[PDB]
Amino acid sequence: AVAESVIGKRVGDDGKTIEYLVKWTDMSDATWEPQDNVDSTLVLLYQQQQPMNE
């Protein structure tokens, strides 16, 4: 339950993403990365993929 590891999306960080998945460095499968701008620092990046507008 901390901001450390974040690497989960339904695709790659190139130009064809699909969905958000957040994975911590202790309890994998927490919240979400891509469509999840509830951080703006660790997610927004993996969300660079997702405009966070669905």
Radius of gyration: 10 Å
CATH class: Mainly Beta
- Number of spatially distinct domains: 1
* Order of SSEs: H
Q: Helical region count? A: 1
Number of strands: 0
Q: Share of helix among residues?
A: under 10%
Tell the overall outline. Answer: globular
CATH fold call: OB fold (Dihydrolipoamide Acetyltransferase, E2P)
Q: What share of residues are in beta strands?
A: under 5%
Structural class: little secondary structure
- The termini sit apart by 25 Å
Largest sheet: none
At CATH level 2, the architecture is Beta Barrel
Domain Chromo: 2-54
Organism: Arabidopsis thaliana
Subcellular location: Plastid, Chloroplast stroma
Protein name: Signal recognition particle 43 kDa protein, chloroplastic
Please supply descriptive tags for the structure shown above:
54 residues; OB fold (Dihydrolipoamide Acetyltransferase, E2P); 7% helix; Signal recognition particle 43 kDa protein, chloroplastic; little secondary structure
Describe the secondary-structure layout:
Layout (H helix, E strand, L loop, with lengths): L42 H4 L8
Brief overview, please?
The chain has 54 residues and is mostly loops. It contains 1 helix and no strands. Residues 2-54 form the Chromo domain.
Characterise the protein shown here.
Residues 2-54 form the Chromo domain. It is found in: Plastid, Chloroplast stroma. It comes from Arabidopsis thaliana (Mouse-ear cress). This is Signal recognition particle 43 kDa protein, chloroplastic. The protein has 54 residues and is largely without helices or strands. It contains one helix and no strands.
